[PDB]
Amino acid sequence: PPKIVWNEGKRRFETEDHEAFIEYKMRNNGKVMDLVHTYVPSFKRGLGLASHLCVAAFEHASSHSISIIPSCSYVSDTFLPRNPSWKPLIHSEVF
């Protein structure tokens, strides 16, 4: 899997070249990490990066006891249905 760095200065996880990332926002006193946008340019498609970036962020929230809101569409309509085992990290009021 490609190295995904945590770039806090920007609240995103990103590939090391900065070119693909998922952005978020922390809600409720740090406890909720909301995923707002996953971005992979067309020339980086086909490398599985969006999903790799969503794993980084889900792992990071699981490791830190955060609940995720799956606000980006890539996440809620592609990531979560394909990776159900991550569903329990979703905050319980989303769905």
The binding site for CoA comprises: 37-40, 46-51, 73-74, 78, 82
- Residue count, binding to Br ion (CB under 5 A): 20
Binding mask 62-81 for Br ion (x = CB under 5 A): -----------------x--
Beta bridge pairs of residue 67: 32
Q: Catalytic site residue 54?
A: no
b/e map 54-64, b = 16+ CB within 10 Å: bbbbbebbeee
Catalytic residue among 72, 80, 89, 90: 72
Beta bridge pairs of residue 87: none
Q: Taking Cα atoms as reference points, which of 42, 38, 43 lies closest to residue 58?
A: 38
Residues that bind Br ion (CB under 5 A): 2, 11, 15-17, 25-26, 30, 40, 45-46, 48-51, 79, 82-85
